[PDB]
Symmetry: C2
Subunit: 362 residues, 2 copies
């Protein structure tokens, strides 16, 4: 089932006339074009039974025609009212438009209403989020590229911490992000976390210009955007020899994460995956300190479906991608998290990141 066909089937089922898709990430997802319109107007118009139309600024039309296929492409000059050009091209009859409710601003829905009349807007985002749940081989490959960058970030981060000489959490963040920028990474997927010692137990912890603590653990949670797709991974290392207590917390988290990784395959449920890690940490005596769900979906965003959490009986299927990230967080003492995102295969799963999970001493 092609994604565009699926949206047309939705329009026919809901008796909605057309889409006007505006989020650049959705446009890239559905057309392959990474179109940045800024505050100029772009929109993908899928219909119940007609050729899809892609509307762009005039200076993007040449290239859109070359880098997309199957779309009827037209543009507008800055001297024109974009909504008027849309109306002039969409000839009859429009009373309902499917839009992305959290993206489209009032100026755009009012612009559409000025040309088409009193239209009923319908939210397309639930459908798009459902479509994103199962990744194609092409998407999985793009996520592997992002995962390879994340592994390089760990290598850079560990080495930067080991140099000591007053290096701070924020120093390490800057160095990681500097090396990524040099390699053409447009942005990290989320704010890089480097947290020393007990600071890693703070759920709202953020790296600051504080020196990393000797003989304490050091948490690295990081990820990049590459080719439109995200990575997300956590490793916790030791700066000098840790004490026995912190080393055992790491061992517990490490084993819980590996047990969930060894368990994941099609047919198990999200609840069951969460429980493999949660039960192990709870048996070890630290259930009170593992205070978030085991995992979240990842794709173009760092936080999408599925939710790997108690009470979700969703059956895991091939092509799902999600995090596996148990942790133990004891305020004022120690925090450990170990995280990979993974994709589900026909008969198991594979991680997007391969950095050693063991407690390495630097």
């Amino acid at each position: 089932m092609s994604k565009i066909e699926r949206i047309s089937a939705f329009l026919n089922d809901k008796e909605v006339d057309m889409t006007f898709i505006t989020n650049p990430t959705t446009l890239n997802y559905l057309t392959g074009l990474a179109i940045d319109p800024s505050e100029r107007i772009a929109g993908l118009m899928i219909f119940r039974d007609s050729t899809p139309m892609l509307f762009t600024p005039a200076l993007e039309v040449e290239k859109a025609k070359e880098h997309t296929s199957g779309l009827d492409i037209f543009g507008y000059e800055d001297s024109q009212n974009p909504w008027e050009v849309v109306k002039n091209h969409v000839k009859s009859d429009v009373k309902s438009i499917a839009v992305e409710f959290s993206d489209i601003p009032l100026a755009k829905t009012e612009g559409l209403k000025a040309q088409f009349g009193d239209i009923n807007f319908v939210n397309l985002t639930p459908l798009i989020e459902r479509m994103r749940l199962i990744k194609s081989a092409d998407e999985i490959e793009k996520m592997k590229v992002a995962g390879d960058f994340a592994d390089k970030c760990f290598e850079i981060g560990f080495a930067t911490a080991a140099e000591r000489n007053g290096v701070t959490e924020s120093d390490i963040v800057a160095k990681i992000e500097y090396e990524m920028k040099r390699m053409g990474v447009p942005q990290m997927s989320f704010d890089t976390l480097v947290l020393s010692g007990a600071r890693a137990a703070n759920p709202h912890g953020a790296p600051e210009n504080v020196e990393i603590q000797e003989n304490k653990l050091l948490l690295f949670d990081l990820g990049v955007m590459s080719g439109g797709y995200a990575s997300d991974a956590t490793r916790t290392i030791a700066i000098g020899q840790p004490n026995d207590f912190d080393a055992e917390i790491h061992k517990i988290v490490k084993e819980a994460q590996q047990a969930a990784m060894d368990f994941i395959k099609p047919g198990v449920t999200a609840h069951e995956v969460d429980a493999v890690a949660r039960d192990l940490i709870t048996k070890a005596g630290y259930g009170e300190y593992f205070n978030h769900r085991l995992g979240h979906g990842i794709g173009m965003d760092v936080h999408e479906y599925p939710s790997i959490v108690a009470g979700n009986d969703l059956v895991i299927q091939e092509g799902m991608c999600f995090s596996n990230e148990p942790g133990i967080y004891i305020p004022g003492k120690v925090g450990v998290r170990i995280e990979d995102c993974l994709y589900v295969t026909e008969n198991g799963c594979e991680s997007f990141t391969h950095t050693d999970h063991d407690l390495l001493i630097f």
Copy 2:
């Protein structure tokens, strides 16, 4: 002269019951709070004749109260419907709300309508833009800090280029942004441009992992966000001895930019400022190659008002801030731009950036 009083006067003039201001930059402009709510809900509610209310996510309430006065601050927990919490707190009755049409997504206006009924929305953004046109002394001081960072960026950028040894445009960009990050400047005001030789003549040029050319010029266009305010500046240097033709292009741009700077004072028009530089470049024989407006406004954004462009007879006033950035772009030969942003004073103007404008050889 309070900004809030000015908005209340608008509501009374237009017979609008209250605001629901959502853009984080506007919220900072009017309250001083740098609140990034992300996908959680925040809103500033100014009324015709009652105390202003600030609605935030629960975890932002404590900081809102600590650093504001005169606002009634209340929050909502993630378990609550934010629109219900808003409705329960507003005891006056509401039929019209002033909002920012280009910011507020359909989910938020529909959330308001679900609780308040059939609301008439009125665009507040023309007023906000009018207020932002004239900067206070406090805003100019913050913009001077951002410009001072931009000057540090040039020093770093020039030095990184001088090291040669295969350094690329993207290498230099990465080093600039790395040093800004280390100084607590996590984001630039726009995508840093470093463009070598004929690549600087491309109006859509972007830095890539290509080595900088010897005996060609090198264009640096950059700026930072600091304290909520932006900077923006361009310098063009030489990598090794330039050729005479490129050096003369630089001289023409340099003289045109300085001539416009010497001309600016209250009472001149935007058209006249543009014409000072444009007439020089045209007399020199390169009018066809100066293919953009002389300047744009700057403030919290790098793209605001006034527009320094032919046909804009706007009278320049004290406190306006804008760029002065002539350029000559000869495809496949050379591109030179020299840019400062400036603030208009009682009897002239002053620049936000002070890096040498001369054609320096590195």
